[PDB]
Amino acid sequence: SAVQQKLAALEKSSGGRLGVALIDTADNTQVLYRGDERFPMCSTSKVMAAAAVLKQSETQKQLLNQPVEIKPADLVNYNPIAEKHVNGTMTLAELSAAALQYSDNTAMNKLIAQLGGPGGVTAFARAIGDETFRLDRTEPTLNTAIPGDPRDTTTPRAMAQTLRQLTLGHALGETQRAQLVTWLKGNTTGAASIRAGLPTSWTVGDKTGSGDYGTTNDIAVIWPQGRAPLVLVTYFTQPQQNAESRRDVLASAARIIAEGL
Ligand SMILES: *[B@@]1([O])O[C][C]([C][O])O1
């Protein structure tokens, strides 16, 4: 298709490896580019950890208000929100918001701990029918993004389907789903990624990811004004370990997808 030729050209121009999955919920049609190749998730994995905690809260009704102590030892490499609460507490709701909206790595590690380790995050993925997602490590080492390493990867197709289920489907309870959507819509890190390739009138909720090997990711739910929502996953990684982030590639892929409808 025209869109796949343009995505392939974008990829060729970029020097890296691009993975795209679009789901149009209007007719359940899919557009895939390297849709079944594995990519390092980096912080896009935080959506799964937050959703897993939300699932727990369907039975433990007060779970999200549980306070969790932030100690100096908990701080890792990127903790914009947790740093503000060292020697204090944050609720699991505040940690979920911080992980999603600021990509806080300490918050992610607390969510992983709440789930019993990376295996508990992966278990949630399996429980909602995602056989591809795997979380193997905690922050910050899950971002090493080593070529060929299957740890902490998923495929664009799998992540698109899972994000659809979590946000637009009913993998979560009604209140939990709405909370996740609210959190994603309030993301603060996504202005230069998928959002930048789309009409300004469209509502977007997204989660970015960045890691070594210039890994630059964004996963989004998109609500166009007067039109069925779309799920768009854009993963990008590069051959040099110290490569710079390329958020412009994700914006461009989004623009190409948006043009083609
Ligand atoms: B994710 O990818 O978003 C930011 C942090 C940086 O360690 O991880």
The residues spanned by each domain of the chain are: 1-261
Tokens of residue 57, six digits: 């809260």
143 lines ligand 1 (CB under 6 A): yes
Residue with tokens 């959703």: 51
CA separation for the pair 35, 160 (Å, rounded): 10
| Residue found by looking up tokens 């166009």 in the block | 224
How far apart (Å, rounded) are the C-alpha atoms in residues 201 and 92?
A: 32
How does DSSP assign 118-147, residue by residue? HHHHHHHHHHTT-SS------TTGGG---T
In this structure, what DSSP letter does residue 69 have?
E
Method of structure determination: X-ray
The reply to whether 193 belongs to the active site is no
Taking alpha carbons only, the member of 131, 107, 137 closest to residue 119 is 137
CB 211 within 8 Å of CB 42: yes
Q: Which of 39, 41, 42 to mutate to test the pocket of ligand 1 (most atoms within 8 A of CB)?
A: 42
Q: For residue 124, what are the contacts with CB-CB under 8 A and spacing of at least 6?
A: 48, 51, 52, 55, 115
In 3-state terms, what secondary structure has residue 192?
coil
Q: How far is CA 107 from CA 53, 146, 243, in A?
A: 12, 24, 26
Report which protein residue has its CA nearest ligand 1's atom 8.
43
- CA 164, CA 152: separation in Å to the nearest integer? 20
Cα separation of 238 and 1, whole Å? Answer: 25
Residues 6+ apart with CB under 8 A from 125: 48, 132, 133, 134, 135, 162
| Cα 167 from chain centroid (whole Å) | 12
Q: Closest by alpha carbon to 41, among 245, 251, 219?
A: 219
**Residue 152 burial by Cβ neighbours in a 10 Å radius (0-12, 13-18, 19+):** buried
With respect to CATH, is domain 1-261 assigned 3.40.710.10?
Answer: yes
Q: How far is the CA of 35 from the centre of ligand 1 (A)?
A: 23
3 state SS of 18: strand
Ligand 1 site, residue 96, Cβ cutoff 6 A? no
What is the distance between the terminal CA atoms of the chain, rounded to a whole angstrom?
12
Rounded alpha-carbon distances, angstroms, from residue 176 to 128, 129, 221: 15, 18, 16
